[PDB]
Amino acid sequence: EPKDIVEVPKGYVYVNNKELSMEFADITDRAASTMFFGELLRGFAVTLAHIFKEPATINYPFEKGPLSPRFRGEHALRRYPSGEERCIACKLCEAICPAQAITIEAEERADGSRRTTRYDIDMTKCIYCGFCQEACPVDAIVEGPNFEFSTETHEELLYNKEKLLCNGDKWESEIASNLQADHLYR
Amino acid sequence: LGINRLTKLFQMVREAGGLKQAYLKLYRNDDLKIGTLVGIDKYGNKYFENPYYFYGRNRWIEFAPHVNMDYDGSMIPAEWYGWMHYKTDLPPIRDGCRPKYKWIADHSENLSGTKEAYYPYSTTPNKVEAWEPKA
Amino acid sequence: PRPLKTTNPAAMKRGTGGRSSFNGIVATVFGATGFVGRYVCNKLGKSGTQMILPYRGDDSDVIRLKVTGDLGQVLFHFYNLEDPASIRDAVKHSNVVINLVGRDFETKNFKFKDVHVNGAERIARIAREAGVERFIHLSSLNVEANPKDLYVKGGSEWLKSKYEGELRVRDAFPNATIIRPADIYGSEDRFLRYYAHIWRRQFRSMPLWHKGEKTVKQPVYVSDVAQAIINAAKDPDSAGRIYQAVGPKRYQLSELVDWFHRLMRKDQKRWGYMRYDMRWDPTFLLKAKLNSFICPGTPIGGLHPARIEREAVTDKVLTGVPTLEDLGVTLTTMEQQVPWELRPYRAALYYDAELGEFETPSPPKCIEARDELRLFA
Amino acid sequence: DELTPLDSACEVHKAANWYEREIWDMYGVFFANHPDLRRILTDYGFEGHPQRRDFPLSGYVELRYDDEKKRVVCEPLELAQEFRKFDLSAPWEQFPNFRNANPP
Amino acid sequence: NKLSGKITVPTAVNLSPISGVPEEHIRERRVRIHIPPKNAMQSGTDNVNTWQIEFDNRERWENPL
Amino acid sequence: AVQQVRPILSVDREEARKRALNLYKAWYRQIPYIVMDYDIPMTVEQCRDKLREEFVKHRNVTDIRVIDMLVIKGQMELKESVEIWKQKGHIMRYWKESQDPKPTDFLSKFIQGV
Amino acid sequence: QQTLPVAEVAQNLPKKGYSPFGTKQSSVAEWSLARLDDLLNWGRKGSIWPLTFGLACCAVEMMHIAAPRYDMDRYGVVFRASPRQADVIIVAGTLTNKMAPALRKVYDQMPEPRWVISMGSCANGGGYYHYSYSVVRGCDRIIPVDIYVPGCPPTAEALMYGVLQLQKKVKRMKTLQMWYRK
Amino acid sequence: RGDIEKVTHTGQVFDKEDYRNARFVNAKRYVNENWGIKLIEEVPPKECTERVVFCDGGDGPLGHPKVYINLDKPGNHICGYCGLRFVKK
Amino acid sequence: ALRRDVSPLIQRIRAFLLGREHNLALRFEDGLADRTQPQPEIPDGPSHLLSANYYCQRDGRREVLPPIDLVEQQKQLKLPTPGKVYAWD
Ligand SMILES: NC(=O)C1=CN([C@@H]2O[C@H](COP(=O)(O)OP(=O)(O)OC[C@H]3O[C@@H](n4cnc5c(N)ncnc54)[C@H](OP(=O)(O)O)[C@@H]3O)[C@@H](O)[C@H]2O)C=CC1
Ligand code: SF4
Ligand code: SF4
Ligand code: SF4
Ligand SMILES: [Zn+2]
């Protein structure tokens, strides 16, 4: 190795202190490198080689993934094991929602129960942050795992309670799995 | 050259069902691989896993045949979705601990750009009542 | 005391004006993907109006109109003029309908009758059965009960069809508003694109009927026509009233074209504008006939003979027939609008000559009533 | 204040040059001797300095696109859903130590 | 004959034009300087110790969609 | 009710006019270039007319300091139009052609809502 | 709401055809124009060229899609820099007022048939900055959006799923077949 | 179409002559098929001995917060959160 | 027999061309963790200690004071340097 050019103390590493020798073997080496592009040859052979590594493209949509149980995607309003709506209109989800993408209006159903009438989310204002589900005291609303919910019309994105309930019904099995995975851990 | 690789080609090509049944599979999926029937879906789909490949390729799906070339990303049902994403290592065939409630709907595609599309609408009955002259 | 139609406060006018304030108007705009549809719909969206935009072309042709209104203010409804069922469905919930339907030339699927009158009445009958408060129609200003051609025999069918459309629409609808423009000039317009496009020109010699010196034209600007449409749509007291839509100052086609070429820098040294007599040269008609016969879509530059008869026809206004001033619409003049309008087509900045310092194109000069009587002698 | 100018640090630290431009744009605090007091962040022809606390959150105007004019036009404000504040005020003083301390 | 260019000017300097508020709001809207009302069903009173200003309600309709 | 306070630029009302009219020179002299450079409908006479009204926009400004700032804004906008940083949309902004002059007499207000 | 058919229903049903139009055409002209539309759509569907506008935060996903995990040129998608040669524009990130005229200008300088994907919440409806004095609330107010990819940002899978959805829209577009009626 | 006729459990049908019906000329009006009111009605009222019972509705930390409901009154007692029903007799 | 690799020849040339001994990069189920795992228990904290755990005698937010005026501090009562000199050199 050539000597340094600035003496270095610890807690540092100078990345250029190494000297460019003037020894004849050292200059002729560099000269030969320039005259026959050895460095280019090294890089050239690298890329040839690296053809022979198998590409890592997932054959989407057939092959696909991976995600994790906590993935934050399509919203869903869950239902109790009896089928009753979990949401009680406590309105914390709206109170925390950073984007203010949630709107709620609740009253008493004829049974006298505290329940929502309108429950709206705008996934053109939602940031899929998950503060809503981290706040909800009964796990009423959750960031379901679906993420291929793409629409041709902007109006189609503003979900109301009917749409959200449908997603909950559609995805209930998977959401049940994740919560069983994370409830004691979250 | 063919170091026990043409042999593997013979396995997948022949037992596919011949030239036609190898080409149509290839023609549709843009690749032909070998796995085991993890489980047959309720909707004609067929799931295949093979640890020989890596995580991207570990698990894959042959969509229902009646979908000629209209495959979609949402065709996966709920019970299989987690397995398909490496989100649960328990095949639905194996873990019956997931809920089996009644109200659960059946799966649906991204019904968009079609008469079956969702469209939002107010979910609050009107606020203020108008005075009725007749009464 | 004008009655009311709906007593649902949700279905009732509200807001501060803008893209959100619902104006209490629900409109279908037949032929929205046109030269004037864009101007109408943008005005209606500015109000904050609900639109149904029926369309027969690929929706991609109309997707641009989605930009004209806030969410849910605009719906696209595929139909066909030959399907009365679809039209019924498109008008059931509607409050107003506007009939911007009509081509300038003839098709293979539509002869001027079936598209320009027979279709219109079907629309009106369906609209009337649907119980639609307000109906609007457009009919060229030159409309005559007994059209007579001026230069080419088979070139007055448009005028005949226009008269037929008016009378039968009024027959099948008690009080529709039939506004009547002629030669609307604007961006992406029959008028200026026609006088600009190449095939219209001969080598460098625009052919005009009687040198374009025996014609009176009074074009109007498109937006002022649109703004009139909305203002007469908001008002129901305009119902059952024709309106001759004309601009401020009549003009002579020679004055216009010379001014046009001045604006386009077409007259400095070399481009060398000349004005023929269309009658002298027998080549212009063949261009129209061939250009019609060959093009599958709209003929190149709108060269079809019907356009040629239109320029020949004079613009006969009448008193008593109300006007834009009755509609409370200020009229931007050509002198304000056209220069910018034609700025894209300016050209001919030769290396051989001088540019820039050439004066601003000196405007044209109107034609007064007695001066007209001199013209016609 | 919003009126009197203020000294400039451009002549002291070259680093500040952009910052003075930023405050000028964001509050309107003039800076004297500043080389070039061009606005930085807000768009051209923007009136008012938004970071002040007497300025509405959503601003006074908003843009769209015109077909009559083939151009984008600024319009008076119009919001699909009015920004719903929440009145998050403490009724119970949660901090005694700062109560009488720092009095005039 | 100067104190770094100091000037004598009236204390009350109207700043409407420089401000940037549109004249429409300035000419059609008032301000209601007051103290925020005390909540009826509370008992701590350390959010009504300040003087507050706001602008009169204009309008609210409901989005048709 | 006077305050002994710092200056900004102009020490007397006449210097203020001197600065204010200097700006009026730059803007008057600029107008033709913008008519050429910015492909917008506006013509020289209209641009000149607006420039007049837009100074008249604030005639009864009184404070020396306030009028100084108004000029500071103008010198900025001058440069942004002098050089072509602005855009055709931005320059036309002075006309407000998207919105029709809203109704003003009491009935038109009354019949058209608050 | 509809739902997928069940196993036995699939068994009864035949192949779903390839051309979304179907093969029910009556006359020679109809059948011929059906095929030419199919070829056109096939061309415009297989090769689609985004413009890579990519203002912000969302752009990183717009790059990960180009990355070798969910390869996008695999599908026939390439990032042409020049808008004259770009067929699609993936508007991604926030649209501030300074940008609004720029986006408009870039859009219409691109020749059609042009499709826009509004990626991310910031473009879809202004996203998290919706009540801001400087942001265009959505990008629907500047340009005609075609496909909305919700997310903040959308996971790369979501984005290229939307791309495929655009391919489906490009597949079913009816231009020649229905000109014949026009 | 029935889609734009059904009564949402919240209790809305667009009036037969109401322009907001128009939005569904080309899209479905989703209405959910499970109405919580009917379902909870079907679930029978559980009964106990003790004067005071406790419900979490769901199970463990997968349900609503634990709540204690007294049953000394003659009638039923509905869980505030889940709507389960209790009766001591 | 463990990971899909190109045939041994191409492997050897590939190692030759790179000039470093190659190690595979694609992630296999065997390589990565047991992808389904037992339920974790988070150990309880030190302030969850059950007694002598008063909040009043461990809280910070009620502990912080207003800023102090140093001159007035002195009025109540080696050239000074902000801190240890650093050889940023
Ligand atoms: N300079 C002028 O054009 C004048 C205007 N008028 C009248 O005003 C109206 C608007 O004028 P303008 O926009 O320039 O004319 P256009 O040629 O531009 O017609 C515009 C609309 O008419 C639609 N159209 C034509 N035929 C049909 C059809 N069978 N079915 C459905 N739609 C059809 C077109 O639909 P699509 O594009 O999708 O095929 C198009 O959207 C016309 O009806 C005209 O009679 C009167 C005086 C002069
Ligand atoms: S936090 Fe949960 S229970 Fe409360 S209103 Fe929101 S969804 Fe309903
Ligand atoms: S994920 Fe975040 S932004 Fe979206 S609805 Fe929930 S709390 Fe609001
Ligand atoms: S939508 Fe989300 S990811 Fe996209 S720019 Fe906005 S904050 Fe970033
Ligand atoms: Zn309970």
* SS3 per-residue string spanning chain H: CCCCCCCCCCCCCCCCCCHHHHHHCCCECCCCCCCHHHHHHHCCCEECCCCEEEECCCCHHHCCCCEEEECCCCCCEECCCCCCEEECC
User: Which neighbouring-strand residues pair with B40?
Assistant: B46
For A166, half-sphere exposure in the C-beta direction (CA atoms, 13 angstrom radius) is 19
| Structure tokens, A62 | 């057939």
Contact G18, B68 (CB under 8 A): yes
Residue A74 amino acid letter: E
Does some domain include residue G92? Answer: yes
Interface membership of A51 toward G (CB under 8 Å): no
Taking CB atoms and an 8 Å limit, are G7 and B118 in contact across chains?
Answer: no
Strand pairing class (G147-149; G115-119): parallel
A103 close to ligand 3 (CB < 6 Angstrom): no
Chain H residues with CB inside 8 Å of A110's CB?
37
Contact (CB, 8 A) for F9 and F22:
no
Q: Please give the distance of CA A137 from its chain centroid, rounded to a whole number.
A: 24
For chain A, the residue count is 186
Closest residue CA from atom 2 of ligand 3: A129
- CB spacing of F41 vs C13 below 8 angstroms: no
Q: Which neighbouring-strand residues pair with A77?
A: A141
Domains of chain C: 9-250+314-335 (3.40.50.720)
Closest residue CA from atom 3 of ligand 4: G153
Question: Which pair of structure tokens corresponds to residue A134?
Answer: 């981290």
Mutate which of A115, A151, A177, A180 to test chain B, going by most B C-beta atoms within 10 A? A177
Give helix C283-294 / helix C305-312 axis angle, nearest 10°: 140
Geometric angle at alpha carbon E7, from E1 and E9, rounded to 5°: 145
**Is residue G140 one of the residues assigned to a domain?**
yes
- Residue I42 DSSP label: P
Residue with the smallest CA separation from ligand 1 atom 17 is C103
Is residue C14 a contact partner of residue C26, using CB atoms and an 8 Å limit?
Answer: no
Decide if D45 and F93 are in contact by the 8 Å CB cutoff: yes
Residues 6+ apart with CB under 8 A from C248: C331, C333
Which residues does chain I have within 8 Å of residue A185's beta carbon, measured at their own beta carbons? Answer: 39-40, 42
Q: What share of chain D is helix, strand, coil (3-state, %, to 5)?
A: 10, 10, 75
Closest residue in F to G100 (Cα) is F89
d(CA C90, CA C81): 12
Strands G88-92 and F2-5: unpaired
Among A80, A86, A93, A160, say which to mutate for ligand 2: greatest number of ligand atoms within 8 Å of CB.
Answer: A93
What type of residue is C217? Answer: K
Q: How far apart are CA D68 and CA C53, in angstroms?
A: 18
Ligand 4 touching residue G56 (CB < 6 A): yes
For the CA of A93, the nearest atom of ligand 3: 7
Instruction: Report which residue type is found at H57.
Output: G
C174 touching D (Cβ < 8 Å): no
Q: What CA–CA distance (Å, rounded) separates A157 from A149?
A: 9
Tell me the C-alpha distance between H79 and H88, whole Å: 14
Between the alpha carbon of residue C339 and those of residues C260, C346, F31, the distances in Å are: 8, 10, 18
Domain that holds residue G123: 45-172
Q: What CA–CA distance (Å, rounded) separates C316 from C182? A: 10
Distance (Å) from the alpha carbon of D35 to chain G's nearest alpha carbon: 24
Q: How far apart are CA A49 and CA I11, in angstroms?
A: 9
Buried b or exposed e, range G14-53, using 16+ CB within 10 angstroms: eeeeebbbeeebeeeeeeebbeebbebbeebbeebbbbbb
Chains touching D, CB cut-off 8 Å, 3+ pairs: A, C, E, F, G, I
The answer to whether residue G16 sits within a structural domain is no
- Contact, C166 vs C172, CB < 8 A? no
Location of structure tokens 């913008």: F34
Q: Under DSSP, is residue A117 helix (H, G, I), strand (E, B) or coil?
A: strand
Give the residue, by CA position, lying nearest to ligand 2 atom 1: A136
Helix (H/G/I), strand (E/B), else coil: B38 = strand
- In one-letter notation, the amino acid at residue H42 is E
d(CA C366, CA A117): 66
Check whether A93 is labelled as a binding-site residue. yes
- Size (chain I), residues: 89
Question: What is the end-to-end Cα distance of chain G in Å, rounded?
Answer: 33
Q: What domain count does chain G have?
A: 1
CA of E12 vs chain D CAs: smallest distance (Å): 12
Q: Is residue G70 part of a domain?
A: yes
Q: Which atom of ligand 2 is nearest to the CA of A132?
A: 1
Which of C6, C14, C47 is the best mutation test for E, with the most CBs of E within 10 A? C14
Which residues, 6+ apart, have CB-to-CB distance to B83 below 8 Å?
A: B38, B47, B59, B89, B90, B91, B92
Residue ranges of E strands in chain E: 7-10
DSSP symbols for F32-55: HHHHHHS--S--HHHHHHHHHHHH
Beta pairing class for C50-51 and C26-30: parallel
CA distance to partner chain D, nearest, from residue E16 (Å): 11
Tokens 């023929």 locate to C276
Q: Is residue G153 within 6 Å of ligand 4 at its C-beta?
A: yes
Contacting partners of chain E (3+ CB pairs under 8 A)? C, D, F
- Candidates F98, F99, F100, F102: best to mutate against D (most CBs of D within 10 A) is F98
User: Which of A67, A152, A160 is facing B87, going by the closest CB pair?
Assistant: A67
Residue for token pair 């008032």: E30
Asked if the bond preceding I66 is cis, omega within 30° of 0, the reply is: no
Tell me the CA–centroid distance for residue H11 and ligand 2, in Å: 21
Residue G144 within any structural domain of the chain: yes
Question: What is d(CA A178, CA F74) in angstroms, rounded to the nearest whole number?
Answer: 61
**Using CA atoms, how far apart are residues B55 and I30, in angstroms rounded to an integer?**
10
What distance in Å separates the CA atoms of residue A174 and residue B83, rounded to the nearest whole number? 10
Q: Are strands F2-5 and E7-10 parallel, antiparallel or unpaired?
A: antiparallel
The DSSP call for residue C240 is S
Please provide residue I37's backbone torsions phi and psi, each rounded to the nearest 5 degrees.
Answer: -130, 155
Return the residue of F nearest to D39 by Cα: F76
How many Cβ contacts (< 8 angstroms) between chains D and I? 12
Say how far apart CA C183 and CA C194 lie, in whole Å.
Answer: 11
Distance, CA of C133 to CA of C232 (rounded, Å): 13
Q: Could you give the 3-state DSSP secondary structure of residue G135?
A: strand
Residue G57 lies inside a defined structural domain of this protein: yes
Residue of E nearest to F74 (CA): E18
Phi (first) and psi of residue G130, to 5 degrees: -65, -40
Q: Does residue G127 lie in a domain region?
A: yes
Give the bridge partners for C137, in sequence order. Answer: C99, C178
Distance (Å, rounded) from C-alpha C176 to C-alpha C168? 11
Phi-psi region of C348 (alpha: psi -120 to 50; beta: other; left: phi over 0): left
CB contact under 8 A, G17 and B68: yes
Burial D7-25 (b: 16+ CB within 10 A, else e): ebbbeeeeebbeebbebbb
Q: At C54, phi and psi to the nearest 5?
A: -65, 150
Which one, of C81, C8, C36, C20, lies nearest residue C230 by Cα?
A: C36
G29 occurs within a structural domain = no
Q: Is the peptide bond before A66 cis (omega within 30 degrees of 0)?
A: yes
Give me the phi and psi of H85, to 5 degrees please.
Answer: -125, 135
Q: In this structure, what are the phi and psi dihedrals at residue A75, rounded to the nearest 5 degrees?
A: -85, 155
Asked if D38 and G67 touch (Cβ cutoff 8 Å), the reply is no
- Does B130 contact chain C (CB < 8 Å)? yes
Atom 4 (ligand 4): residue with closest C-alpha? Answer: G58
Alpha carbon distance H15, A184 (integer Å): 48
Largest CA distance in chain B: 95
- Residues A142 and A70: beta-carbon distance below 8 Å: no
Does H48 carry a binding-site annotation? no
Side chain identity, residue I54: Y
Binding site residues of G, as ranges?
A: 57-58, 122, 152, 182
Inform me whether the C-beta atom of residue H61 falls under 8 Å from chain A C-beta atoms. yes
Residues 8-27 of chain I whose Cβ lies under 8 A from any Cβ of chain B = 8-9, 26-27
Which of C 240-299 lie inside 8 A of A, CB atoms? Answer: none
CATH number at residue G92: 3.40.50.12280
Can the peptide bond before residue A137 be classed as cis, meaning omega within 30 degrees of 0?
Answer: no
The whole-angstrom separation of Cα F26 and Cα B134 is: 71
